[PDB]
Design a binder for this molecule. Sequence first.
Ligand SMILES: C/C=C\C(=O)SCCNC(=O)CCNC(=O)[C@@H](O)C(C)(C)COP(=O)(O)OP(=O)(O)OC[C@H]1O[C@@H](n2cnc3c(N)ncnc32)[C@H](O)[C@@H]1OP(=O)(O)O
Ligand SMILES: C/C=C\C(=O)SCCNC(=O)CCNC(=O)[C@@H](O)C(C)(C)COP(=O)(O)OP(=O)(O)OC[C@H]1O[C@@H](n2cnc3c(N)ncnc32)[C@H](O)[C@@H]1OP(=O)(O)O
Lengths: 265, 265
Amino acid sequence: DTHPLLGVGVTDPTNGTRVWESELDPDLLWLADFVIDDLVVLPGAAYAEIALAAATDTFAVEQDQPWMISELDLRQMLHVTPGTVLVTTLTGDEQRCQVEIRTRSGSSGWTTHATATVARAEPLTTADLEDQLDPDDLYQRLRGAGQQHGPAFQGIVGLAVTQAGVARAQVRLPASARTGSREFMLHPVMMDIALQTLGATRTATDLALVVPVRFAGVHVYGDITRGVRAVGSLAAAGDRLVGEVVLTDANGQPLLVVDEVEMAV
Amino acid sequence: DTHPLLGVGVTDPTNGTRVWESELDPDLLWLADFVIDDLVVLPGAAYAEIALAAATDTFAVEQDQPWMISELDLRQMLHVTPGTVLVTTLTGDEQRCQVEIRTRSGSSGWTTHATATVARAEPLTTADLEDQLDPDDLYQRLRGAGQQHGPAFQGIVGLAVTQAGVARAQVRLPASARTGSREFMLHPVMMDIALQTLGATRTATDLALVVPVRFAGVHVYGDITRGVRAVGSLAAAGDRLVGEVVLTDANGQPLLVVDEVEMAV
Ligand SMILES: C/C=C\C(=O)SCCNC(=O)CCNC(=O)[C@@H](O)C(C)(C)COP(=O)(O)OP(=O)(O)OC[C@H]1O[C@@H](n2cnc3c(N)ncnc32)[C@H](O)[C@@H]1OP(=O)(O)O
Ligand SMILES: C/C=C\C(=O)SCCNC(=O)CCNC(=O)[C@@H](O)C(C)(C)COP(=O)(O)OP(=O)(O)OC[C@H]1O[C@@H](n2cnc3c(N)ncnc32)[C@H](O)[C@@H]1OP(=O)(O)O
């Protein structure tokens, strides 16, 4: 009945802050599947998940998706070592607040990995010739570079890129990531699975590893597990690879809208 | 392995504070035995206990009694209602800090009951004719006024007052309060049991209910369960009934030193 990533938390009466602590491990669920150069890093998507549940455990809301993510900076990666404790802090109001996700050293030393801003949620054909692409080349490309994705993250079963740069991918939630997923507000693997569609976009498909540093405008409208198609596009600005993905269900309705996915090497 | 009164706690990284939360109940151990006018109030002694364990769970010390209590204000009593949550906050350093003990309303409203100051611990015959007194008159007196003590708090098995005002009492730890006592740093019933020796002092024994508001200089040197004698004395200053008790073991060595026990109606 407890969120395996946020952990239980209490409120600090001296100020207005609220803290959360959670035990992390490479054995926790699908964490082992994300790997950057043989290390169990934490996927960027996860932070967004934790940032939302914090506002949910703090405020009373009678909606299935009352929160949207405004800004999401990611300062340093998190090596998931055994016995790692994850510390989260919330501060603000129900219209808008702030969330910091840090890692604890001993008991009085911490290292922040992601600062966030959360607010209330908002309301909901010419020459794009697709060249059918093999996913096991991307995965291989991605893995080759140094991003050995795990089975639970191999959700792209089919994908192609248009003659303009936009990438279209048929995604699904593999069963290994389906274990213990009702506790989430926004699955962290899907959101990554939606993000890795940027590996097929034109600007990406000529650099022969890219990591997402900052997000902006992450909108959730429905349970994102019911998603089968993601449309990925990105541009560049020197070192500013800005992106934009959208995850939609069978009937074309939107589920996940990510306005800006600024990336870097 | 967890303190039943302090509860588990986590550290707030936004500031330097550390919070603790604990479930309280009238069914918890000997809590039901303390009663003020048919209500399960929390005994003053308990706060001192919680204030010490907070500094112990916060700082590394290789001593059996490294902390002493400097000041202990008690603002409002705590009606122990079922499902009551107790909130404790620590702030300061290992040489000297501050502790607040409050009660939580819902999740974001609190009421402080006792502020405290804690610091490092310090190093360790003429006309006093005693008139042997019956404890079951004091208890009756005390109960009569409106302080129906419980069995676990009936530790005074023999007491007398000298021809000057000082009260001497042979105290013991009843078995009903002996259940689950290794978890404490300073038993809260004993300290009360040492305090109720002030009910035999001269200034007290002519008012025919007194409550302790503020303490000062509470020194602990040993496990206070091994105590068999308490020497109680107090004076008055209008509404300022200042006291002083000391709990000693069999071989006369001191165990509990309370410099000031300012009381009021
Ligand atoms: C996908 C793989 C893993 C994941 O899923 S996690 C995804 C997100 N998390 C990450 O792994 C990225 C974490 N960090 C990085 O990789 C990124 O840092 C990075 C390693 C790229 C880039 O290194 P920097 O630390 O320099 O980048 P910053 O995050 O500090 O911000 C960019 C820029 O702004 C400046 N900046 C930003 N914030 C601050 C502050 N606070 N103070 C001073 N200066 C600042 C800083 O000088 C930086 O200079 P350059 O990056 O060299 O251009
Ligand atoms: C033994 C029975 C139960 C126990 O074991 S618990 C033992 C300790 N706990 C208690 O039950 C006592 C709790 N409270 C009381 O009983 C005590 O209040 C009391 C009910 C007596 C006395 O009432 P007060 O609230 O007035 O007393 P204070 O604690 O506020 O302090 C004394 C005095 O200083 C002033 N004061 C002190 N702190 C403040 C602040 N912060 N702001 C403004 N003014 C303040 C205040 O005006 C007070 O005026 P009087 O008491 O009327 O003389």
